[PDB]
UniProtKB/Swiss-Prot annotation:
Residue ranges, annotated region (Disordered): 115-135
Residues where Ca(2+) binds: D15, D34, T35
Biased composition (Basic and acidic residues): 115-131
Residues annotated as catalytic: R29, E37, R81
Organism superkingdom: Bacteria
Subcellular location, record wording: Secreted
Protein's gene: nuc
Organism of derivation: Staphylococcus aureus
Protein name (database record): Nuclease A
Length: 135
C-alpha cells in the first residue's frame, strides 16, 4: 500500500469526507470503521454522531498534510465513494476515531482488511478504557 496526497474540500460526517484527489473532486468513505452518523432519517443524529463528526472535521481541518491510502481490494463502493485509510499529518483518522471510542470496527470484507488487526487492537483499548460509545 502507498499513501498519496490529497486536499480537503469538505468534511461531511464522521465516516465521510470530500477530498480533491488526482485533481478530481471525490467523496471518500473511511475504511473499516462505522461511526454514529448525523445522516439518515432512517436514523437521524445518533448518539455520539455530532461528536464523531466534529472529531473527523477538526482533525482533517487542522492538518498540514492529508494522505489517502487505498487497500488492496476494490477502491470505490457501490455509491462511488473512494474506500481508503485517511491520514492527517501521519496519523490515521480511522484508527484515531476507534481509539477514542467514537467508531466501531466495521464488518470487514477481504481483501480490504490490511489494517484490521491494528484497528481491532485500538478498539479493544477504547472498550477497556470505557470511552464514549463504550461508556
Amino acid at each position: 500500500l502507498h499513501k498519496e496526497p490529497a486536499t480537503l474540500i469538505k468534511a461531511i460526517d464522521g465516516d465521510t469526507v470530500k477530498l480533491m484527489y488526482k485533481g478530481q473532486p471525490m467523496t471518500f468513505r473511511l475504511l473499516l470503521v462505522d461511526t454514529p452518523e448525523t445522516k439518515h432519517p432512517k436514523k437521524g443524529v445518533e448518539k455520539y454522531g455530532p461528536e464523531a463528526s466534529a472529531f473527523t472535521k477538526k482533525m482533517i481541518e487542522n492538518a498540514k498534510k492529508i494522505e489517502v491510502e487505498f487497500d488492496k481490494g476494490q477502491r470505490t463502493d457501490k455509491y462511488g465513494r473512494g474506500l481508503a485509510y485517511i491520514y492527517a499529518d501521519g496519523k490515521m483518522i480511522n484508527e484515531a476515531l476507534v481509539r477514542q471510542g467514537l467508531a466501531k470496527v466495521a464488518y470487514v470484507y477481504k481483501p480490504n482488511n490490511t489494517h484490521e488487526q491494528h484497528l481491532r487492537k485500538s478498539e479493544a483499548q477504547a472498550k477497556k478504557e470505557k470511552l464514549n460509545i463504550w461508556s
